[PDB]
Symmetry: D2
Subunit: 439 residues, 4 copies
């Protein structure tokens, strides 16, 4: 599944629809980035620029001009076709093929941006620009100065600049059926990688070995890159939320927390599964795992239109405090403990965040993530309990870090879980591992 | 194999040895880099900062102070130990453990760099700084302005600034036995990945599938990342030197050029192998492959102390022109054709480049890469012939891109080939592929 | 005459009136400026910041907040009272006395601007800021980034930024009776300086001597500084529009063009008078002077509400071409010559420009300065003829540069000439000079 | 008197003499500076650029190239001759006339600086550049990056950058006989201005009136601009060291402290004289004035080769403490009071500073201004006593600010006072004022 040219065009029309007449929206591509000396990291297009073009080249600017309420057109600045630059670094779309290919009205060489942009903004009343996103973009836009100082040439600069991100990000917050299909495939690809990791894990292997298995699985399904740096934290490393070293050998008797997700057609998969390295939870590991699983299951039953992340979080907190008191990790009255946020040393992050072109996707959460949920919103559900190796708790719980994380989409009557194809019930994990351990 | 703390210390002493008395050398860590929004690319330490520390954290500065000819000491500025930043993002070395761990005399918090640096440069005569490398580094160093304007406080700024790169890069150009062992392991890891790719390749698979196989092989041996973006160009894509899209399905009857190398302990492996997708070279494919192979073999026999890349290139050019004339691709007198650089449309890059902490390693080449080779120098050997799909040559050669690339180390009496463990003779490639194709 | 605190307040209310509810206008002071090393030029406040405050200190920002349609208040950031900085450099208004003194509601220390500004813009919908005026102002305003990234702290940034200059400059274009009184005094002060210069001029004196006389006259009336760099161009120097060297000794038989105006209470006086150095126009000097004077007189009769600078310019051009044809300087048909802009080599600048807090005052001119004139507009009237020393014209006209420039205010039924108190009719100039030359 | 072309050439040769072979010194002109909107302050050339050229145009760079120990040449980048830019703003030297005029070997258009500079620095070992002086200069110099990255074009960048200021400023610290003649004329011009001010001062005049008299006197002698902003502090304003408002009406019975100096041929005059507004010192005014005068006279007797500013300051401090104890302003033992720096609340600045192309001239002072004085050094001598209007001292001394400041040149056997032509003994001041007050 993917996002076609037609949908990119619809998104552009939806923005223009919200734009004032006599205005221009400017959307810039991500700059290339250095890894070391003259080598660069694999190119990652800006999420917002991608959302409107599906074009993976740097040095490109999308210009949406709304002359009036009926008249509007698009202009793309992109790298010119160059034979020696292409023989060396790869093919370029160029200007001739851009209009038909992307669905834009015109295409100009990026090399001419400073000679053409001011001419496109001349006499407009508003310019929509995401100021402060990229320094090179700001330099180009600020160079407005030509218009401001060009009255003798009969040039006028738009006196209003509006940040298009709040509107674009609210658009991104609500997925189209096509986007949900893409995310559904990403969740499925990420689930297969996690299953594979569970089936490959053996005491003595290095944490990065599971990362290697996961990235090979992402790749074979057409998702070349992870949507974020893979986390493989065994033993004490599981208490580090974003532990990315993945350098320790995995110990017999320790749990391993895997946080990994692919990037398929620009969209993020986001899955976390914690399981025993030897295929068998110990009693103390199983006791913490149960609290985190109930937190997840209860959340999955509750998430729906009408509720909110904040509301569902209160349910998880009560589940957590209850279990921590029962195990002896917390001491006191449940309601009193809840009132003093006593769960915080063991659960210090949020239960959810939006999911889309970015793993921590754009969109307003409302204070304390209280915004009412509506169909089309995609988010993660990732309770966790992390007992520090030196926490003042019963000895057998120290160094246990557990998180169990799925990706869901709010539907008309609940939510659809995009990553339930990888097991999370302890007996199922053990059963899965036991079958793999026998060949 | 690896580079221990002792060797990092020796390198620091070797720099100090070359430094003037009453001076300070400043070496900055690479800044973290954004991939998208709030997600960052996997951290890659600056090669020069790594060369002297083996420390993989950002926001760190190595300060080597040479008080006089007998007295010198080191100061490291690095991120302070922070409990909440570590619970979230990972462990930090901190200041207490830095001296013993890295072998530096003192360690100060990076947060105090602007309050301490000027005090360290006060009254020195020279400051060695790689100006223009990183903007943040330049801002810190330029803020010298405190010393210049602080005469009333009895402060004086060094009036001389020397770029330490020419000296450090000349150091990097000559590998220690330990570095050669690391590169030898990197060449071996990269060769196993290429062998694996040859054995997995089947018509119909996508170019990125081979990239997935290669990166999984790098990973299992402890080389998490490639030293450069993997190139898998089948058919016409083989004529694009650094084709990294790797998006086309591989065709029965086409050749596939794979350019890939791992990064092991900071060092680059750099291997290219071109072979038939179906396990069998066609006559026309075999005819071009032979010219490129002879170019490589002859070069491997010749490379040694006393010669140069330029000198060996002349040998390759004659081999190329000779074969292109014999095949009908070039027309005329060999010596006349050589004199007019007639091979250039088919071989447009250099035969070698240095290899080390960077795939295109630092070090002076001499005009036209004429510097006399000496033991300890590591370089690649990567003749290639690329016949454009529209080249005015016999129809059967169009769209053929071939490159065969090994990594070598110049020794006292020749060179040691670090990547010969992956086959390159056509019968050997076919034999290898034929055995894999039967299971 | 001057502009009191009440008027500065009215101007602030008039801006707020035009502002949208839920917005803030930011107006920054001019930065101090270096003359050489550690010495600075005499401080000149930004015209727009002055227009709203009458406050002559650097490091100050005026913040006008419009909470809604009925509620609005002002906050001033200004240098804190410091005993040692004041003993050395001068008194500072400080925060305690600012509210009453300037008429603002609150005053905060400039040192706290970055800790307070974002708090003042939090939750507003619009921020009016003159982007690109001062780099330091832009850095402060862009540091919006705190609001954008502070959603977890419940902070929101205004998504709209509007340039307040077009509105403020349109305000500045129309003078209040008080401003016209100030400009009237400035025109009178500048006229006395020009009269003094005419009465002091003697062959052999240096051009800068007249500049010295002029600046001494400005000073004695309370106008310490010129509104622009004084121009004293004798002989060939008169053909250089903004000749400011004023280094040549004045020759018997040459004309001297003086362009000078004071800055009184922030407003510009702008007067040009050209006269013979020896007190007597030669026939050739008198013949060119007559054309320029008729151009000025005709313009002074015509300027009124309903007409425009462009319209009056056409009248001047016909006068010029007519006289140049009659003298032999131009050859051909008057109407044909006018049609080919044949006067341009001799009159290459505009006839008028606005006058106010800046000598070349803000305000839209309309294409080709065609905007219809209205009461309250202040402008200059400064025809000129400059015959280059090598111009292909009758020998006796070469090296003659003449300009005669007055400042006027458009009234309900014409214009009031603010600088007619300094003579411009040749017989009057000669009469004036002849009387001075006898003591 | 002035500095001719030959001397500018000698200075350039003296720098080249101290430069290493295979190097280039870069000296940039001061950028033009905005006063308001499109009007600029009168141009002030950078002191160091002036010191080597005597050229008063912006957008110019002096390049001194020392090929070896015998071979060296100069290249000047300066604004090209442009007919329309000159008709409007003034004449430009241009490239054709530059070599002969300034005495440089070649002159190139400033517009070509980025295409030519790197070519001039190619292959050199050292570049002398005053980093951080001007941002535009740094941008030009840093754009070295072309050389660093141009090895394939056979370009090499100098690896050493040396700040030429310490050497140039040490040169500037020692005046040539010609420079001393210029400073002698500047001191004489400034003394006539101060005499004029004393003779014009009358109760009721405004402080800025004396500033007007002073600047008119500077001007008539060919010193158009002050070397620093004129200070005219009457009454309590005299206790503000650099009071430049000069806005108060001068009161009968108050003292007026005038700090003013001209800028003649680039050099600074620097004189301070404090006298009664009504021509008669009161007893309390006379008692403080005597302490400051003795401090000055004693210093003038002492200043010579072999001593230092620090040494002479100790003499002044004893004189001050002695007189303050005798008047009742200080209480205690003189030696004890001196030991606790009890004079500091009344004398808080230094006794001297260097004088030359900058009023606070370049040159190393040594810790606490202890550098041994040598012939050729020019400095000021400006003891002062400032009793705050609220100081806990006898009522009659409050609000008295007095400073008496001369400019001297250290000679072989003492010093020559360059500004003694304006009276400083109280009876002489009164006598001077009394004669002027009668007409
Ligand atoms: Mn996750
Ligand atoms: Mn997540
Ligand atoms: Mn390669
Ligand atoms: Mn290579
Ligand atoms: Mn004028
Ligand atoms: Mn004018
Ligand atoms: Mn002074
Ligand atoms: Mn002084």
């Amino acid at each position: 599944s993917e996002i076609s040219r037609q949908e990119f065009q619809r998104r552009r029309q939806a923005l223009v629809e919200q734009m004032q007449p006599g205005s221009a929206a400017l959307i810039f591509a991500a700059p290339e980035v250095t890894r070391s000396a003259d080598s660069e990291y694999p190119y990652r297009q800006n999420s917002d620029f991608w959302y409107f073009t599906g074009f993976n080249e740097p040095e490109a600017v999308l210009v949406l001009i709304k002359s009036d309420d009926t008249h509007n057109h698009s202009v793309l600045f992109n790298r010119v076709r160059d034979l020696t630059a292409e023989i060396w670094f790869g093919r370029r779309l160029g200007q001739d093929a851009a209009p038909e290919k992307l669905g834009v009205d015109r295409a100009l060489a990026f090399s001419e941006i400073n000679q053409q942009l001011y001419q496109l903004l001349n006499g407009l009343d508003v310019v929509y620009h995401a100021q402060g996103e990229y320094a090179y973009a700001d330099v180009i836009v600020n160079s407005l100065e030509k218009l401001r100082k060009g009255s003798r040439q009969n040039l006028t600069a738009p006196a209003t600049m509006i940040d298009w991100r709040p509107v674009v990000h609210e658009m991104r917050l609500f997925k189209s059926p096509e986007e949900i299909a893409v995310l559904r495939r990403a969740g499925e690809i990420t689930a297969m990688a996690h299953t594979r990791a569970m089936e490959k894990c053996r005491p003595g292997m290095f944490e990065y070995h599971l990362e290697g298995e996961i990235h090979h699985e992402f790749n074979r399904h057409g998702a070349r890159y992870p949507s974020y740096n893979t986390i493989v934290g065994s033993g004490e490393n599981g208490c580090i939320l974003h532990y990315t070293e993945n350098e320790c050998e995995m110990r017999d008797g320790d749990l391993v927390l895997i946080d990994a997700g692919c990037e398929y057609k620009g969209y993020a998969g986001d899955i976390t599964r914690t399981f025993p390295v030897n295929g068998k939870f110990t009693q103390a590991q199983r006791e913490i795992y149960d609290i985190v699983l109930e937190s997840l299951e209860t959340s999955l039953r509750l998430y729906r239109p009408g509720t909110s992340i904040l509301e569902v979080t209160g349910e998880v907190v009560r589940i957590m405090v209850s279990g921590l008191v029962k195990l002896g990790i917390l001491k006191g009255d449940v309601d009193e403990l809840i009132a003093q946020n006593a769960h915080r040393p063991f659960f210090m992050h949020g239960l959810s965040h939006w999911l889309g072109l970015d793993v921590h996707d754009v969109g307003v959460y409302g204070q304390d993530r209280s915004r009412i949920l509506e169909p089309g919103m995609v988010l993660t559900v990732e309770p966790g309990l992390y007992i520090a190796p030196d926490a003042e708790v019963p000895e057998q719980y120290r160094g246990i870090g557990i998180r169990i994380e799925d990706d869901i989409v709010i539907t008309e009557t609940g939510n659809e879980n995009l990553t339930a194809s990888v097991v999370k019930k302890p007996e199922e994990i053990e059963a899965l591992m036991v079958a793999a351990r026998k060949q």
